[PDB]
Write a protein that binds this DNA or RNA. Sequence first.
RNA 1: AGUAGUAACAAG
Lengths: 50, 733, 703, 485
Amino acid sequence: AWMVQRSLAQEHGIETPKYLADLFDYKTKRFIEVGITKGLADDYFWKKKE
Amino acid sequence: MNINPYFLFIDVPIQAAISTTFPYTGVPPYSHGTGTGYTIDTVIRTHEYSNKGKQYISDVTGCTMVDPTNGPLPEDNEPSAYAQLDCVLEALDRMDEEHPGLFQAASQNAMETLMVTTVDKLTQGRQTFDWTVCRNQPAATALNTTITSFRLNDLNGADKGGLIPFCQDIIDSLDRPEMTFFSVKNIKKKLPAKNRKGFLIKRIPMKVKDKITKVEYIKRALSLNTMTKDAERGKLKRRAIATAGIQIRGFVLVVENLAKNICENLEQSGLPVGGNEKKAKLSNAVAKMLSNCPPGGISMTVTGDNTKWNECLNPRIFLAMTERITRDSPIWFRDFCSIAPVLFSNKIARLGKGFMITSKTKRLKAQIPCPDLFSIPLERYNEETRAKLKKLKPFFNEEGTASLSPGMMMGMFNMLSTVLGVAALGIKNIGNKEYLWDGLQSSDDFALFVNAKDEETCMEGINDFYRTCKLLGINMSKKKSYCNETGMFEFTSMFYRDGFVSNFAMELPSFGVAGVNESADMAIGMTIIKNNMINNGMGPATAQTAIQLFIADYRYTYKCHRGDSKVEGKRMKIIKELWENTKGRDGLLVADGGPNIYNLRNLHIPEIVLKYNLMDPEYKGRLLHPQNPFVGHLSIKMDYDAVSGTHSWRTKRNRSILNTDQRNMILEEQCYAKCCNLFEACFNSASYRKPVGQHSMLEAMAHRLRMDARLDYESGRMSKDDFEKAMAHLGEI
Amino acid sequence: MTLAKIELLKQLLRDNEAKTVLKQTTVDQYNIIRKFNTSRIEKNPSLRMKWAMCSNFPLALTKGDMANRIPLEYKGIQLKTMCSIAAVTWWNTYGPIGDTEGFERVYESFFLRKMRLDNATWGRITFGPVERVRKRVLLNPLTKEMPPDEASNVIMEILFPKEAGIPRESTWIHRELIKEKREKLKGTMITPIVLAYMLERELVARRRFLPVAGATSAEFIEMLHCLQGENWRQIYHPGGNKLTESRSQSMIVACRKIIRRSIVASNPLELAVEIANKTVIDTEPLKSCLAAIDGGDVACDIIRAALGLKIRQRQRFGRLELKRISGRGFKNDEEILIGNGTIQKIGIWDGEEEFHVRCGECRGILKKSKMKLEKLLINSAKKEDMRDLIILCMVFSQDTRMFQGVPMYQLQRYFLNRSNDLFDQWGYEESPKASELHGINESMNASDYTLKGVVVTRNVVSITKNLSLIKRTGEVIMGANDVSELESQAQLMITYDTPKMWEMGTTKELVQNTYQWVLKNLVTLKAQFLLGKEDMFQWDAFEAFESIIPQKMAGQYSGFARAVLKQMRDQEVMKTDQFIKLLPFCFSPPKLRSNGEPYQFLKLVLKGGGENFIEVRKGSPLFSYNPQTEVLTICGRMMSLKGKIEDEERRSMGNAVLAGFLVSGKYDPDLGDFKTIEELEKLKPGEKANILLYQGKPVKVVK
Amino acid sequence: AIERNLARMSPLVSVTPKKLTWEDLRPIGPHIYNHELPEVPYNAFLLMSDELGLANMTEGKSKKPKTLAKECLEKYSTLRDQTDPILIMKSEKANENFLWKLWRDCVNTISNEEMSNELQKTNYAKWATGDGLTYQKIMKEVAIDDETMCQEEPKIPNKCRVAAWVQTEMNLLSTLTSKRALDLPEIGPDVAPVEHVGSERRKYFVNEINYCKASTVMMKYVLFHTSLLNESNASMGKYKVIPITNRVVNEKGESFDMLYGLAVKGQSHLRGDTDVVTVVTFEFSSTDPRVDSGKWPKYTVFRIGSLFVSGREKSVYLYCRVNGTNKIQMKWGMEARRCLLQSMQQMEAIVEQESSIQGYDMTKACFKGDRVNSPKTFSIGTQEGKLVKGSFGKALRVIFTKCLMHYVFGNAQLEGFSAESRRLLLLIQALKDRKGPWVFDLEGMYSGIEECISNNPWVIQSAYWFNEWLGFEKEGSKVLESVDE
RNA sequence: AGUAGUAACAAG
């Protein structure tokens, strides 16, 4: 998973994320992080932003 | 006028001229034939020292077990194995009192190391008794056969990565009713020969399969393969040494790592310190005892030596040592450290090849194996061997092995035994008498300092030390040990005389050609000369002569004499052409018949780097061709600095044995070689760094090569076809 | 390449044996199966090499494109079949001329060894004693030192950036070094595994114990074999640049070693100037080092003042660097219980002191007393600089809160990593409510509950004859006895451009050289002793010997030695071996008892360790005599006294042991035990006593 | 628990300390003086002091060994073409005709125009090689049923007495000659002053050893074992002749090529390290074996002619012997050059310590002497029961010879002797230094030493010399006991 | 025979 993350980031010409990413769109050239909360979405949203 | 070499000692003292008394230029004594006579001596003598204690038949293995621990005290100066538990524990309590957090801190360091330690850590212990094939193999080879064998009986602890689940499977494999495993078997194929009988047994080996019952497997796991020690220095008669299996190795590492952490902190320890750091530590330890000595009293040093070290020391005492040491640690780690002593306590000793019988009248010989050892009248064996086989009877097993509960044969517990030796040194006084002993310990060899008001009390202090050591299972050799006033002594072959004097003859065998290769041995040869100038007291004249004598031995070995010289040979015929072709002759290496530019100042610089500016451009290009076929598969005991040129080559594997065609052996070796090379092609860091992953080795490569294909297509390396062919090949896998 | 790997992977997987390996074997187990060798470990490689060279085809060739360039034979010489040793020589003579570009950048570390030797200038050789102290040292100089764990991650980022894994903080820290070596190591065609080795040898430190004498630095340790033996010295000046920190240590060691000599002689300031003028730290003089470097210690300021330069009142505590505003401190060896539960001898600093502080970027002012942080005014900066500044000042202050919450450099290294133990045990208080002043919490952020005695603000001599620096007011700031007595090893070479360089030497060097000077001039010294009364005792050579002896016992030994020698002078009982042994102790001004008699002694102790002492009655490690062969043993070295011993000296030793004592007869059991020093001193004149010279030779002696 | 156990343990368990004295140090190895035992025979691989090199003149550049041996024998044709010899001495189990037939086979095979040095596998060669003398490997089932087969009682080394020749070997090998044998290669140029001092020291140290007899003998072993190891691998099945060759240079610099004799290599399928290849050594010598008959029971000596040395014909004999060696002994022969380093380091250490005393390089002062200092003298040996002094250079040659004898007579007996006797040596040093040494079981030390004294000439002669040296120290000890008291 | 020395090799 780290080999995939580094190989993508190195090829496209971007900085590698510090955490382990969950997805990556090829057209956007942007890593994606998925989260499945129970209660409010915005509460879990801004916790990940920190 | 008759010359006398000993008369040198009139003018010069003996420690100053100690190098002369070490005949290391001579040939060391090699063992001939079988080692069964030497092994049986050790088995008899081990039981000889413990026979007064408890005897009982083991219900697990079905073997005669002797137990001298908490046995009757000795009433003579013979070697006693009769150690007393309470006396051992008091010496350890004394150590724990003087060294407070050390017992539990060493346990946690060993414990936390154990948790991080992987299974591949085992593959660096030289020879190991491979229980599958029942002969000694390398640590990596013996481990890999055990991992594959364990998978056949549903034991995939090795797959998890850590050393703990592998060691969990070892103790659980003892409970298994049957043990299926991969083994090797011969193929006795007949051929015509021109030698007496007129035939030839061409043995071909191959990977087969076997099954062993619960009890018979337990014996193999507890077994120690024995053999005679070749090239042993400073001794008349030869002796046997054992080599244990892969099972016990994991547990011994932890017990030794525990005792290592204790030893480092102990002020009177010889191990694990070595070289200059030892010489630093010991000279400090001596300096204290000289200035500790009272005014008018006497400090006396005993040049120590213990007899029958491994044979008297019992595993049951080493079990008690681990139980005391790991007090505050959890129950799982207490149980882990306890396993290694338990296996040694119930061990079995293999007895080598056997004995040869011959008829001089007929001129015929025959090896009798250990299973068929008593299948013959004992009168037909010789007078000395007859007495050994009679004493072996009670401990002898049906499958041609010997039970051996006491002793260690060749005990791996050096560190833990050094702690037990220091434990005796830690008492210092008994009965509040007018003396104070201390010393130095390095497994078997020791050195005891004894401060007191008069020398009559010093000897009584030495007598009290002698007697205290008997209670721990340590027997001081009255024959080999001796004593004198402090100022000079000997310890681990290092001779002291108001300071440690140099001994050049100890390192003299290292000065020759090492046996790796031309490029490496040159770098080694100069480094050995360079180190001995610093440490062993080699002067500049002798250092420069050692340079000269190395190049001579280097040239005669590798057959690479000076190009200008008229020495004929297979290599030399081409060297003479190269000497003519090359302009910058100083640029040529000694391996290509060039001149030796090395001197005292430039021993530390590699030859290729030294001569770089004097080389020709065509010569250096060929010498440093990046993809040359001589430089094989490299991967990052001493180390050296050398440039990887064409002279960095590899020797052939030793396969040509007594008409033994080993095609199938090498097929398995190539099968792993092919898989590992392709993994290194995919993952380039695998040569440098240790790869990690419990997942499949194919899965790592498959997912890697998919991303290689995708990024090559989008960036524009591969065409539209090559990507679709590449993606197709992965779809199958 | 990707297509070639996949095609080989497929064709490998077709084989059922290889398929069973790749599926079952884990990525952990790759390490095990790489080292799978079926044959045997070679127990005699030197033999088997010499054996293999005699046979035809010992070597092995790697199967490839270039391997087929070598023919099956060449001029009746069978090259390959595996191959012979002639195949290797054929390649270098008539092989493919490959690409060797970037070879100097890959093997950059090794070329730096060459230019250090090539550009070096070799000084004098001098034969004489050398005290080699076995200390831990760096074998080779590095590009940038790291641990093995951290270094491997930097090497990984350079060579194999796709296979690095989790990006560590070290990637961000050592980013300029990665970028540099990335650009250098690129065009080369040499294998990655070879590059990784060369990066490791210039990053991972090789530190080993070696016998050192006056040269600890790596550029010296790589030449250590040529620099010095047990019985000779070689002056060497390695080429290239040198670190300022490496000059700073040897500058401190230089000034300390000058002071220890000059204290003894009359007018210390005169010698201090005389020697410090002609000292050379490798190549530069001591003057230039003291002028250029803005650091040093107590000793450097004294020499700076002696030579006549500004005195940088500065103290470096590892990463912290202080400058003195006001106050003086004095050291006290006290035993403090550390919070973990251990007894440790640590030198506490007494009195109130005030320092101008600076730690990297961040700056501030310090105020402390005996074991307390009274105040700590600091400025705003980066988080790592402010955190280190507060921690290093707390450790430097030697507060009880620091100790009760777990020798000074060991506490530094502990609290640099594990700071959470300190900040909790320290405590907190209310912040200052001024306009410019502010407070901060544990995480280096602006807070109301600040640390106890920590404030963050927005705003930013003549020398005596006896070596003590006095202000114009009269108060003194440095002192002769205010220097450390730790005689550590110098990082760089220290040459004293003087005829008397030995005088700044080690204990055993001075002990050996002094007795050698006595033996050479034993004809004139022994002759003048029956003429000149107190003319010989005060000789130039014996000043250097007194600097070895501790100041407290120096006078007592002179009173003792002179009286023992005066027995041999006045009365007819002269010993030559004893005359040689005691004469160097007589230079110091003598210090007798209240009675008028001198202090009696068994052994005369010298500086540095328990080895260094002279025995008055017995022999010792430094000094002993053998009357059988007339061989005087000094520090291991043996000199002869033949031709310079009297015919009536055949004479008991007890006559020249104790001052005011002589041998009447021999051991008399009726008197009883052997009388100790205190018992012997307190006897009446004209009273008998039993004495043991050396275990075996008892004597009856009378006062 | 310790103190309770020690109190209740038997007092019989004790260290038994006894303070050592000179009277307690009894002469080691009493049996070596008993004339009822046979005197230790010569058992080295080649001859040493008794050697004779048929010196042929050359350009001073390397040639083939067969061509060299051919040209050496050509120049001394009377000895080459001898077919009617005189048998002077015979070994017990030797054969006169087979050894002589084999000697002629060597001389004729080497003299011929062909390239091959292979000897024909004759009845005389097969005996001296030991053809078919091994026992046949039968199955275990057959051997168990056979009642005649038994485990052999192992041979134990003989108990021999002091032979006078070992003293003579030590004397003659230590003596100087006009012949340099060493093949020391070049080194780099001297830049540093240390390298200038070292290279200046080598002129004194190396020439002292190089000109001596022991060094010429050392280089004979080295070059023979090198070529013998090569033939052993390269010609396993073939019986081959190998010449005992050595190159030599004199004081003026003209090169002589020495032929000490010829030697027959046997069949050498050497798999194991300890596996043996028989080597039959035919060597020239001026020594008459009848003068000291007890030296030569292993050898079969033929009188083959004479050569005019001085003003009269000296008899040239041919010492024939069946000998043997193994892969290890051959390898340690090739690394016999290190005998220089062991002796040269030991004596340079004294020069360095002496340089520390006087402040300058005391190399010349030790060897020759100078303005200030006398020459370094050592107690070299005895003469009619009194000490004799020798120069610095002699002591170096003595110690160099000592290190060569460690190789020539290197085995388990020398290892155990030198190791166990070293304990006793250090105790003598303590008595010399007046440290008052103690011992726990002195007969235990002697047991370990004296079991190793058997049939090794160097171990026996060392035991003789140890006891002689011990006597002279005991005489000097009477001075120290009368000091102070 | 011989090497060698507590048991082997002297081809398998």
